[PDB]
Scaffold this active site. Structure first.
Site, PDB file in Angstrom:
ATOM      1  N   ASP A  35       7.535   1.015  -2.063  1.00  0.00           N
ATOM      2  CA  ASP A  35       6.163   1.194  -2.538  1.00  0.00           C
ATOM      3  C   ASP A  35       6.176   1.745  -3.964  1.00  0.00           C
ATOM      4  O   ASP A  35       6.309   2.959  -4.158  1.00  0.00           O
ATOM      5  CB  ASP A  35       5.436   2.155  -1.603  1.00  0.00           C
ATOM      6  CG  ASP A  35       3.997   2.392  -2.004  1.00  0.00           C
ATOM      7  OD1 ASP A  35       3.513   1.687  -2.909  1.00  0.00           O
ATOM      8  OD2 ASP A  35       3.357   3.293  -1.405  1.00  0.00           O
ATOM      9  N   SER A 199      -2.898  -5.633 -18.658  1.00  0.00           N
ATOM     10  CA  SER A 199      -2.864  -7.082 -18.760  1.00  0.00           C
ATOM     11  C   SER A 199      -3.765  -7.542 -19.899  1.00  0.00           C
ATOM     12  O   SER A 199      -4.779  -6.912 -20.210  1.00  0.00           O
ATOM     13  CB  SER A 199      -3.332  -7.689 -17.433  1.00  0.00           C
ATOM     14  OG  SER A 199      -3.472  -9.094 -17.504  1.00  0.00           O
TER      15      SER A 199
HETATM   16  C1  LIG Z   1       0.949  -0.951   7.166  1.00  0.00           C
HETATM   17  S1  LIG Z   1       0.169   0.461   6.363  1.00  0.00           S
HETATM   18  O1  LIG Z   1      -0.675   1.276   7.241  1.00  0.00           O
HETATM   19  C2  LIG Z   1       0.397   0.955   4.713  1.00  0.00           C
HETATM   20  C3  LIG Z   1       1.521   0.685   3.956  1.00  0.00           C
HETATM   21  C4  LIG Z   1       1.622   1.124   2.630  1.00  0.00           C
HETATM   22  C5  LIG Z   1       0.596   1.863   2.032  1.00  0.00           C
HETATM   23  C6  LIG Z   1       0.718   2.316   0.577  1.00  0.00           C
HETATM   24  N1  LIG Z   1      -0.046   1.419  -0.310  1.00  0.00           N
HETATM   25  C7  LIG Z   1      -0.561   2.158   2.788  1.00  0.00           C
HETATM   26  C8  LIG Z   1      -0.667   1.702   4.130  1.00  0.00           C
END
Ligand SMILES: C[S@@](=O)c1ccc(CN)cc1
EC number: 3.4.23.22
Length: 330
Positions: A35, A199
């Site tokens: 992430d 961008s």
């Molecule tokens: C599948 S999930 O509940 C999820 C995964 C990553 C993030 C960060 N953007 C938020 C939620």
């Protein structure tokens, strides 16, 4: 040093991507969501409330001879979608694709929100934004990339996400066989802790390119592309029957449609998102209304170049003293 790991879509829509990560000694392999929009490495664990675990693989620190409680440290994170998790902290050895960091903060979840419980394929997150966003208290911790950076051949990682197919995260090197043409680099602001860039504009389908500055973040942890309402309206106006639905929560379109491409500017370069990448399928099982992959950022406070955009490119996260982002077609 370098590392290289395959990242795999969790489902047929590319709702997220998981990458295997080795934690502890002997290794415990968990599939984490890498992430670039957050900065905590957290895992389902033997400490996670039992009713909140439903099929995930868990980290058990008591079975790792290299795990050490980080005494007094806690963490708690809330994501932009309303998901959340919290717990305590261990340090342990963490390896990704052959690249090893000792003493990495591994944040063990005691609680996770229902969205995480309900996704059995995601065993945790590995944050790759800037360490200033890390939530560990009272002593903030560094990301895996920040800990590895000095040892890497080059202080970079790359995201090469696939469309309905596996892709690759590389650390420490740029695979010159993985993209076409040249990489265009663009400036990054770290002031909000994100890989935030501007961008240079957009085009819809075969239409003319509109030169306009769009500040946003490169976020592998967000599924969709979130852009200003003006831009999103211009896109969906080219799809017969598309509309913004308050009840569904965004733009929907007839599943019978063929979607136009969407182009975004990186300096003088252009990245083309094919129309099929923007189809997120029926809103509910069996519906003929389909959910759009380009949505308005109006309620969010920031534009987000999520997976829909990033998977159309080979993306360089350059963590040199002055960070930059690079994009190439592929
Ligand atoms: C599948 S999930 O509940 C999820 C995964 C990553 C993030 C960060 N953007 C938020 C939620």
């Amino acid at each position: 040093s370098t590392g290289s790991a395959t990242t795999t879509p969790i489902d047929s829509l590319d709702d997220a991507y998981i990458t295997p990560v080795q934690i502890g000694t002997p290794a415990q392999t968990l599939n984490l969501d890498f992430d670039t929009g957050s900065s905590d490495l957290w895992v389902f664990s033997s400490e996670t409330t039992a009713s909140e675990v439903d099929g995930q693989t868990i980290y058990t620190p008591s079975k790792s001879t290299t795990a050490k409680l980080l005494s007094g440290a806690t963490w708690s994170i809330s994501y932009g979608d309303g998901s959340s998790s919290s717990g305590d902290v261990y340090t342990d050895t963490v390896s990704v694709g052959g690249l090893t960091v000792t003493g990495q903060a591994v944040e063990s979840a005691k609680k996770v929100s229902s969205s995480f419980t309900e996704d059995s394929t995601i065993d945790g997150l590995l944050g790759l934004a800037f360490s200033t966003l890390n939530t560990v208290s009272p002593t903030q911790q560094k990301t895996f990339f920040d800990n590895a950076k000095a040892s890497l051949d080059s202080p970079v990682f790359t995201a090469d996400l696939g469309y309905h197919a596996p892709g690759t995260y590389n650390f420490g090197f740029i695979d010159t066989t993985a993209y076409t043409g040249s990489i265009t680099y663009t400036a990054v602001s770290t002031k909000q802790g994100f890989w935030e860039w501007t961008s240079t504009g957009y085009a819809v389908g075969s239409g003319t390119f509109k030169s306009t500055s769009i500040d946003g973040i490169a976020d592998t942890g967000t599924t969709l592309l979130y852009l200003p309402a003006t831009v999103v309206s211009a896109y969906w106006a080219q799809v017969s029957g598309a509309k913004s639905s308050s009840s569904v929560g965004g733009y929907v379109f007839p599943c019978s449609a063929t979607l136009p491409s969407f182009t975004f500017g990186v300096g003088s370069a252009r990245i083309v998102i094919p129309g099929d990448y923007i189809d997120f399928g029926p809103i509910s099982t069996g519906s003929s209304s389909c959910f759009g992959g380009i949505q308005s950022s109006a309620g969010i406070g920031i534009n987000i170049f999520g997976d829909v955009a990033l998977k159309a490119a080979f993306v360089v996260f350059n963590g040199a003293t002055t960070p930059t982002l690079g994009f190439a077609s592929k």
